[PDB]
Amino acid sequence: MIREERLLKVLRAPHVSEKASTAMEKSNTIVLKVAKDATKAEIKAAVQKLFEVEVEVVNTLVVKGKVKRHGQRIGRRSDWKKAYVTLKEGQNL
Amino acid sequence: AVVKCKPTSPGRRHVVKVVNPELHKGKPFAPLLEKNSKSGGRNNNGRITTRHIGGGHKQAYRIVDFKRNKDGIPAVVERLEYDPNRSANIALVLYKDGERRYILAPKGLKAGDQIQSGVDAAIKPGNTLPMRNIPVGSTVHNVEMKPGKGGQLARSAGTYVQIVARDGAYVTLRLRSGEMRKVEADCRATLGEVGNAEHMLRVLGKAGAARWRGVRPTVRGTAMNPVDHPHGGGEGRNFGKHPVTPWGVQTKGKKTRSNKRTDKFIVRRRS
Amino acid sequence: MKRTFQPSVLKRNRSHGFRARMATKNGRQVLARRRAKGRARLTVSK
RNA sequence: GCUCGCCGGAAGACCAAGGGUUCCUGUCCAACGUUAAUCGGGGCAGGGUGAGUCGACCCCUAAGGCGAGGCCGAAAGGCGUAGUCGAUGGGAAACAGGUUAAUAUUCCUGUACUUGGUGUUACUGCGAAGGGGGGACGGAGAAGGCUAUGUUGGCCGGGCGACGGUUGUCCCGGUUUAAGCGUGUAGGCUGGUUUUCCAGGCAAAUCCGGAAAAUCAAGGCUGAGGCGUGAUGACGAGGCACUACGGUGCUGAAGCAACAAAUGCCCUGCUUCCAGGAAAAGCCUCUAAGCAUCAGGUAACAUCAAAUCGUACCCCAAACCGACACAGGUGGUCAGGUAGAGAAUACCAAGGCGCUUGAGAGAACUCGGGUGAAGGAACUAGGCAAAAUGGUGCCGUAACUUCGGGAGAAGGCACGCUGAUAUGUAGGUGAGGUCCCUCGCGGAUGGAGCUGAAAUCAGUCGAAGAUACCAGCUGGCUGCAACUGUUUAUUAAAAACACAGCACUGUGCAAACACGAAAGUGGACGUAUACGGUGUGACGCCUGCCCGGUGCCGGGAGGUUAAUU
RNA sequence: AGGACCGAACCGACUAAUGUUGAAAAAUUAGCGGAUGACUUGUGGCUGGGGGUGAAAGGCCAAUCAAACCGGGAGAUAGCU
Hints:
The PDB classes it as ribosome. This is part of a larger assembly, with chains A, B and C. By secondary structure, chain A is α+β, with helices and mostly antiparallel strands. Chain A has a single domain, classed as Alpha-Beta Plaits. Chain A has helices at residues 4-10, 18-27, 40-50; strands at 11-14, 29-34, 55-63, 67-70, 73-76, 80-87. Chain B has three domains: 1-113, CATH 2.40.50.140; 117-194, no CATH class; 195-271, Irregular (Ribosomal protein L2, domain 3), CATH 4.10.950.10. In chain B, strand 11 (143-144) and strand 12 form a beta hairpin. The two termini of chain B are 32 Å apart. The chains are: A alpha+beta, B mainly beta, C mainly alpha. The chains hardly touch. The structure holds two RNA strands.
């Protein structure tokens, strides 16, 4: 499922928002931006090795980037992948 | 039996239908079924090549044994069936070795009757054998034109052929068209007439009845415009043409047979 | 009333898509003329 | 915020297609919004779409597409075999509750299920691209059993009324609970088991098919719903606490029965008819090549896995197709109360709205309506338009007729409410009890309770009882076309086209004919009771004379006559 | 049983008024015909321009079809304005 070079490139950033904070307080679930091509398996092992915590389940979605017009021309933001990584009951960080 | 319908509605008054209680009710023998793809009269270019074909009921194809070359093994007729693909009826026959086939149902044949094919089968209705061993004068149907190729002559409901002569390797047949034709005597034929002679006594009674059979309307040429048909348009009802096909060829009277390679088998043309 | 454009992405792509142009010599010429004109959109794609 | 009004088989809710952030929150108002705009589907920023079992992908094919070689064609290319693609169809599995400003059968809580891998253990013949089964199939109709759902009663909580009465035969509200698991019911289909033999199933078969004995009468298969369990729970009016007054927390009564009842389910059924009603895989079974103490098969427990993409929002529309925030167009699903035959119609519930210029005024004239003295088609090309008729039951109904029709012909009578028959009837449903039982979701008996049209008699209110909405005008003579259909999308729906029926004529199958320089294909997996072309146009009585002209069919002697020599 | 009868949905389009710089480049309102059939409709497919398709009106083939649309021959030609 893993090879360390790949594992280091899969997790991109913490995602901060009220939904992401509540998901931590209420469900011990951390919300992340991950590599667009990442799989739930890679995310689960990357989190388990790097952040050194035990993972229960990983859920993922793909966010469509918003379009912004500019007179006669449009710009488009990038799609990215969101990961809801649920930690095991014994919460850490 | 042919039955008239009562005029409880105007499209019923003239219906006269062929109802045969000998025919199996319900479903056929599935292992002899194939798919049957309707065409709308269009060829592999997607063009209408034969007009007036379209719609009408879906149909499954019954695999019918026109060759009748399971020689030596007797068979019994299990039942007569309705076949949507043809005017004749068919018989489901069971061979002594467990095999089942369909055959054209000859007149008089019914469940229980025994059939058989081969050089030595008995001279009786529903039997098949090479015409060099059917007595001159007999009445046959499902006649082969080449040995072992499969029956092609006199299959439609009520038709039959008469062997009027045998000489050399060739028999002479009076086809149902009236034509006298030579066919080689090793060709197979089945004794009797094709069943369901009352087929020609049906009266569809209404337009929808022809639609159920996949026949679309015919539009008369003289009802068109000149650009569409040589029978032109006019101004009120006008004609004054010599009647032709939509493609300018003389209908009514012009011979269109042109086959020098088979001329030699035609003893006398139909009259 | 009912108008002439009734959309269907599946039918759009089959009649006019990139692969449909590529399938015939003349469709491949539609794409040549279009690349020589310098178009941004060769066909309507995803 | 309190009222009023509108839709309610939609103007509500949910899908697909299509769109693509329009979704939620904050903030802003120039432009966009047919007005103002603090508001917005507008600007700016941030947030938001969570799946083994919902869809896609995936396996399987349909029409059809593509197509190694190949056949054909000046080139380009056309067609096509093996194959390979292609859903609008077939194929494993998840439900109820809670939660967010915005997602949820995806998160959480509870309770499940499916198919694979790995291990353990007991038993065991395993094995396919092949065989067989199965999957797997129409229309119409009948009506029995049910559920969804509703109504009443009971039960529980609350109520005692702004103005005469209201502790009662009173008022209001609630009375909800899934998949899964167990049971195998109303009902549907079918005889079962053993042995032996065999020209079929491309070889093989223990399977299918066929044959022959033996033997038992009950065996198997399918199957809504109910009941139980799931549920020690969830949901639940309300209560008590807090509250930034938006909310949050804790707690929580009854949760039954009877009757009615679908167009949903049993039903891919049953009955019946002719027009005779996909394919392939998954699946079950059979063997072949093989493998034989291996492998593999079946089972229980355990363990692991089920990736990836979609998921926001609009969706009969202000977000899709219409240049517009356009009276247009857009496939499927859901179906509450009263009246009603009803999915018509009227009023309502849930839910959603008052349609993005308003304020006054109360002229002509225009638009859309209501009423009208006397007359009643005198109008006009024409009763154009209006007005009128309109329901159910019973009585009754002409010429003509192809005996079906004409016919709802025409015309007439009854119609509300209350009581009696009967404090609720005929009927429908059906409990306790008693008895039997191959004991059950059983049978008989029994008739309580519940529900309930219609009739007659008597009485009674109004001008009027099919009172509203809703809802045929009728008759006589005649042209034309038999009829139902079809047609000039957008000035013509007709007497025009079609039609069943009739005739002529071609066509012996490598058919005629048609699309194609061709290959190939349609005709047709049809075969003269068939297929094409042409005309006529149900049916009834019938269809006469003319072959000179033009056309077509047949003819061979003579004349004339091409390339060629 | 029925191209059977009455009648919503659904399909159609006989009459009239309105509208005609429309709410709408064909509609709206009141009426109207079919409504188990030659019915109606979703998804996808096939047929291509002297060609298709046509229950036939020269109808339809992407808002003007007795020969579509686009590009090219092209500055066709115009004894005409």
